Amino acid sequence: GATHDLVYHSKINTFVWDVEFDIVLELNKCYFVKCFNPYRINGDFAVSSIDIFSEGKRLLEFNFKITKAVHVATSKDVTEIVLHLSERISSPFPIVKEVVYL
Amino acid sequence: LESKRYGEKLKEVFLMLDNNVVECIKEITESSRNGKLVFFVGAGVSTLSDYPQWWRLVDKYHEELYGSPKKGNYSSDEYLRIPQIFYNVKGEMAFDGILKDFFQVDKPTNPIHDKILAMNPAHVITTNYDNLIDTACWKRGKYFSVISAEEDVANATSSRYLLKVHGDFRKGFKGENVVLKEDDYLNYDQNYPLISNLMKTIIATHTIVFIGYGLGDYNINMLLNWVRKLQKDSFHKPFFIRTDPSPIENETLIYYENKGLRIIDAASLIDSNEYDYLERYSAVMDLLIESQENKFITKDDEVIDYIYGKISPLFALQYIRKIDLKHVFEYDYHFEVNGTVVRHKNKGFGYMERFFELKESCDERSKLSKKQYERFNALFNFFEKNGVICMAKDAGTLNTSIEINSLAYHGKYDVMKKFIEEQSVSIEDDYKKAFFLACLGRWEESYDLYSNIILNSIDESNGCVYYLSQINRYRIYQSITQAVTQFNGYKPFTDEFLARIEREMTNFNIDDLFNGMPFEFQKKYKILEFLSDNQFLYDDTVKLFELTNKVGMSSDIVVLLRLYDNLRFLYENCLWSVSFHEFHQYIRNSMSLLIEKAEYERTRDIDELGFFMEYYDFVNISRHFKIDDIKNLERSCSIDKIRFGEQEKIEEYLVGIAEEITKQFSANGMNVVFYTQFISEAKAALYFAKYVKLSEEGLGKIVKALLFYFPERDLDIGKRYVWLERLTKCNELPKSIISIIDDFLVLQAEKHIDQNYSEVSSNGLYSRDYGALIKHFEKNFISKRLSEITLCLTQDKQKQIDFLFKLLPLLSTNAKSHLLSFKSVENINDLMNGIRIGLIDEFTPEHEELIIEYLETRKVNYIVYMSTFGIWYFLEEINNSKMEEFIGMDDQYDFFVDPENFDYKKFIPSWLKNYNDKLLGKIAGNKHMKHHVIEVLKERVKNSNDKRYLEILMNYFI
Amino acid sequence: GEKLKEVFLMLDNNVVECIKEITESSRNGKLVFFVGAGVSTLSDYPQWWRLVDKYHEELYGSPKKGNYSSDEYLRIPQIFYNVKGEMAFDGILKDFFQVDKPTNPIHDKILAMNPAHVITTNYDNLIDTACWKRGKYFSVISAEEDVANATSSRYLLKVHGDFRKGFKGENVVLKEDDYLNYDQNYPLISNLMKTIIATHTIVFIGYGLGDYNINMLLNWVRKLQKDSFHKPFFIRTDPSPIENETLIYYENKGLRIIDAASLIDSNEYDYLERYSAVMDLLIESQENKFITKDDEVIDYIYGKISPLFALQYIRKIDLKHVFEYDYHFEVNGTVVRHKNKGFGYMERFFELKESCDERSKLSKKQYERFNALFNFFEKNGVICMAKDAGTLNTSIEINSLAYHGKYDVMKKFIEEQSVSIEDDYKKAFFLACLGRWEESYDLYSNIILNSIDESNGCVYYLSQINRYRIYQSITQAVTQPFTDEFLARIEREMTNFNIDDLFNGMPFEFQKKYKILEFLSDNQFLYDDTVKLFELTNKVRSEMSEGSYSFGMSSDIVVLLRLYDNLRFLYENCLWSVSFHEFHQYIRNSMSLLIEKAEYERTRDIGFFMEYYDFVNISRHFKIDDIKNLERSCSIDKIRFGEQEKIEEYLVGIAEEITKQFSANGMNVVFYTQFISEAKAALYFAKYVKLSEEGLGKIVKALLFYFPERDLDIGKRYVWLERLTKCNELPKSIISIIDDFLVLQAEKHIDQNYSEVSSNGLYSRDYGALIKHFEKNFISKRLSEITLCLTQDKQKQIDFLFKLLPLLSTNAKSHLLSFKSVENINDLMNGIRIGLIDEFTPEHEELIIEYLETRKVNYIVNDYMSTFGIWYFLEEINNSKMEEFIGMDDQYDFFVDPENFDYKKFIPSWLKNYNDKLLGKIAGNKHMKHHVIEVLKERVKNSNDKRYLEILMNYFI
């Protein structure tokens, strides 16, 4: 029950909302930020580069069955809604925690 | 007629006066403006609208006591003994019956009980027994505390008094409620103790005007004995207004003048009959009502003194806005910001129009007096300094180029620290030092020295140093409070400090700062009250709203030269009140409107489909914007086609920013109160620095003070890449920026010699990109130091090997041999670094199968780097029929692996600003991508202000 | 502090109320301290018994030691002055009194109380030295020549002389004869002293209950009446506590003693903490720790609220100024704490509210005070805190006859009998709102003359402001109705009346008890609201240009429920100050932001339902071009307008008011100009409401027939009728209305020179088109009879009934076309606009050749040229001559020659102006497609219009 903070950024099709995932890629407290670099000089062909954190970058092999998603400061795990939004929106990382918008 | 016969003939009477009547008109009217005019209304104005006079009653008091009325015309105190002998012989039930017979009438008021009230007096004292004044006060809607008995003084409700000093008949027609008998005049100061003291305190604390009496009249003599028992003009002389038929003898005009009165006679001003009093009272009280007219300036030595009255206190200020000067003078002469005065109402003399004519033409200037000439010199310097030059009629050369000349506006720190450590010689010197200390973050010496200012402006008489140091001390208090609510509630101020500043600034209301002052700071400095609240930028903002709607002659001069007067009143008068964010939004919407106007009016081939950006057009963008606001400007309006001037002044501003980053962040220089102020200006100032063409020493001292000395937690390693890119896409790298960025990468390479150094970065941009940029302008570059680092490389230190594999094209051939004696391709990250530095030309089929296991782990994702594989499948790099199995996992992967089954309303408005020329162009070389991506580009050319989608849709699709 | 809070609890009931009176007079400015010589003998300054001992030493010798009594203090300096002289007297003064002792902190605590005046009997210069270190300016009146030579209205009244002009015995009152000859040597300082005493509250802070000065003030105050005066307060700081008999004796003699040794416990020789003990307990003017019971918070709230029962509404934004800056009242009835370093008196008030078990234990009159305060806070919309409140309510109610435009009852309410001044204040606001400004200015002047007897500074002040704004309405009126006798007296009494000097010239009851009534005399009324719109204008427009559809909580409630409190303070309190145009731009930018927000957040594949109050504001405060700006940008047709029985009765209220006023005679030129703007802007936004047959049929009839000319032209009515008949459908009654309109227009052409003045070029022909746009088989009977009774003459009426030719019968068209034919361009372009030419005979195209030849006569030295190039483009014209007129129009040359037209001369428009067969044969071309797509692309960029996108989607790609 934290849908009062769920924002939908619609130029990368993500759901910016601070959760903290528990994944198997086995890790704990993993949050994802995403970039929107328009004319990234030489940096493949994409819009958005995921920048996975695990209290610091993870340095990537890529599994993350999310087993325990929990909202910050208004807890009691929100895993059901996260799997629901993962079911509808088909993108890499439908729950993103920040967007850079370069 | 009556205004042009009585008025203009009275203007002939204005010319036909002695020199004492006119200055008495000045003193009576200026005290009616100050609130120091007290009228003392008598029984010659209440015997018009005839109310039964006292000699009529003493005659009846002589009639039922003796009989045979006297006719031996009544003298002095015999007025008072006949009502006394009666009271001792006949009684009081006959006395109070004759009072009830004659005094119980209702006479309607004359117009000269209303002309006294039309003067707006502070107090009204009267010796009248009747109720005609308060009846005349009732018909104008004025409330007077009628104090007619002794139990009314602290039981009074308002501070406006109708002081009936001889009693009243509102509580019964008895002879004990008034002062009529002889014993009531002898026993007055012991029956009436509080009304007498309150009367004679008003007399020695105001200006008293007698309006109903004669120069006999024992009441006036009772006030002339008491005022004779005083000193060497402790008091001010009462003014007597004598309205009698005969003119006054000259000896009784000299005698009463030294006895204390100052007689304004009403029969030595007009000519009339014997029995017409109403137009003598009207003759002085139509000539005294002209507090609005002020027809005293009909000479060329009196307009110069009117202007020396309303301007000459304002020489202690260093600048005054024009918008405030239409309040300095009352609401005529709207001063336009180009120095052109327009008349607004001004039903009278053009004293400014006369002042300009006794200005520049010198043949009217020579005929002035001596001290009037010096007053003209000071006023000429004042009006010349502020930017007022002429009228609007004979003025076509309206000038520009204001000058905020203050060390705090230009960001010239560098001299403030030198000016503060000098010796102080004044309070205006300490007021600048305290503003500089406050602007340098040194708020402790600022609050101490501002408190020293409010304790040192007690001896001098200047209510514009004290008041403005008060406001600044309150806004620095709000800066300390807004500071510690982010800082504590990194120890900027001690806990002893935060106690005493939250001890004395408690219950200090800012709105009660102005209306608790002496009257000298009520009218002479009246424009200093929009500053204690945010009614400062009101008129300007509501004259931006219409222009924001509204956008031959352009209207950018109205915005650009009215903003500049706001930045000039604060910094030139050294005001700390710049820490509020409505000024910021005013500048952002102002400058944003000016840039959109100047860009809109640039592509206008006339039939369709200045703002040269000098030095002051950059400081405001720097200090008051944000980086996202400048990005909002660059997304909408192309500022690169602007023709920025003063590029020796903006360059010295930006190397001033660069040296201040250099000095403060070298060993130890950061106050946490000055760092937080300054580092926002250094950020917003260096993002808008692409538009200036710098030198080699100009660029090379900004790039070095951004890569090396600009501190972390406020500019990330990959966040510096955008900024370096902009500053090296405007200029070209002259083998010195190459040495800087090379020295930066060697510095980053030596920070990876230990583990757990990870280069925290938001963008995902890293030192690799710096290597790309170096081999984007310097294709044949070989870093010597990076070559030596890789040649001294061993089996261990796995982080430094990876760092010097991201930077692999900047190496030598022995360095790449010894360096690729350690690494190879074993995963996705080495592959996508492999073709990002260039060293894989064609895929061997183990790479694509490695991508198959990677995307298989992406299938492990979807059961409970992808777009770069679909596009490699789309640009015919991947040679595989297996990769089309991962459908429904990304919308951008499914846009490229399967471009006939992707649902194109799931196609994001973006993704087209993110593709290169070979991709945009093989999207365009398709059927349904063209059909739906053109529709996406069309609707997002509608719902956007960005000009990039139009460039995509023009240059590649149609 | 807390031990002194135990001392706060350990007082008799007189000390506490004296703390209340001393501090409330320090707030009012009626606190005068009378500072003595027991506070200036700390920081020891040489006492008088020391000098009389030296005066006894060089006069007799052998000092006395028989401890000094009464007036013997004054005769030893007198015998000296008669035997030794004055050059020895003034030398001993120069020896002992010429010192510099630095001030104690209790010369500063007197100054920390903010007194109105400071009177002192001290000879020294330690008070003004202590005044110098705080930055306070006092007019030091120490001799008789200083009273009107004083500079400020704050006095340091040294009543016994001073030593600033020399250490002589003639500048002070020291000898015995100087006390006998005081009221004749010192006449003005004495009167100014004893006038302050009987016009303030006096507090003695340095004396003893002997002390001949106090007895001199106790004889004079005994010669007064039955408490004419207020009793002086004595603050006694002595070692021993006071006897009870001398506390009763001096209490009736005039003093009221607050003892300082019956409050603390201390030594014999420590005075500084007794003076500190009372003057640290008196400084708490901010603390007000008197409300520690549940019958004293209810009286604090009955002190700061209960004067405001004469107002009918108060804004929340003003209520955070009513109470000082704690408790920011949010507009949803949720109170948040802001600073409040003390008691939660509002938090306690809500707890002695709804829970009744704390409510029963109140007193009797405290319970009734609670009932009145509960009704007050319930009425204005304050309900709870922010913690235990999730049900925050909505739906405010401006219930005023003037807001709803319900005229109809105002005219009935005015003609009733008046029973009050609040009744006349509503009648005067209704007369002012009905345009009847003469009886308004008369009755408002009757209000300011009738609010002199009652005590209400919110009827008088607000009738003053309204009288000034109706004066600005009369002035703004006559600069663009009233007799010349009227304009003289209103420009006689409103001269030099400053509006900013209206507030700060009032009694102190209207200075603090009604403090929120000062943002109205200037335009600082909508300040906070406007600067909390600027950020929201950023906050919802920065997230439109990046597509951040917030799935959480919208911020339209912040704008929409803060606007509504502004419209409710003015109309419910009956204020005329609605004639200013910053309120208008606030509503336009507010409602414009709400419509763009509600339309932006509608097409979001991942409230603002527009009730009755969401229409009155658009109607009264917009313009027709502003509504067109909204319709060009955001499609309001996809909004789901509710309350369509309330907006419908509003719009038939507008329609009946047009009906009544414009029937025979009803138009005041002062009420017409106000109302007819609302009737225009209200009836243009009337497409969005689904009307009935009686709803539509009474608006259409009150627009075609009764809406007066010079403000709505004949062709200007066609847009409005089109909108109101594209929302609904014509139920054979609108057809009867528009038919009756055309028969009315046909009979106005029976005489010459009637020309139907119209801006748009739209005429009665178009009304005929619309009738045969929904009623294809319509035959007007009356127009048929008019054309059947037609003769050879009356050439205007024949032309009118040739523009309306398809609405006729067959005998009417035979007899009617027995007069006309095609002889020029205008009959041809009416010919194919009513339909009766199917194909061009080649004399028509040659007639166009002579017409465009006269256009060549134009180019050598109502444009019909583009309609010839498009007829050449849609393959109607069969001619090779018409391509010779190149370089005369850019739109003719766009169609006659679509390969030589320079396409940067192609106008951004012209594409919103073409039909489906033209847009579609433009698209069926090569260079028209190539350049018109580029024009459409760049003008899909630099526009907010959604029509160019519809052209470029539906026809080009």
Numbering used by the authors:
A (entry chain C): 9 to 33, 38 to 55, 58 to 74, 78 to 119
B (entry chain B): 6 to 494, 504 to 565, 577 to 634, 644 to 898, 912 to 1005
C (entry chain A): 12 to 491, 506 to 631, 644 to 898, 910 to 1005
Extract from the study:
DSR2, a Sir2 domain-containing protein, protects bacteria from phage infection by hydrolyzing NAD+.
However, the resolution of DSAD1 and its binding region in DSR2 is relatively low, posing challenges for model building. By employing local refinement focused solely on the DSR2-DSAD1 interaction region, the resolution for this specific area was improved to 3.2 Å. The sidechains of the majority of DSAD1 residues were distinctly visible, enabling successful de novo construction of the atomic model for DSAD1 and the entire DSR2-DSAD1 complex. The DSAD1 structure comprises one α-helix and eight β-strands, forming three intertwined β sheets, which deviates significantly from the initially predicted AlphaFold2 model. The aromatic sidechain of F59 from DSAD1 inserts into a hydrophobic pocket constituted by the sidechains of I918, W919, L922 and L966 from DSR2. The side chain of N21 from the DSAD1 establishes two hydrogen bonds with the nearby sidechains of S957 and K960 from DSR2. The first helix of the HEAT repeat domain and the following repeat R1 directly contact DSAD1.
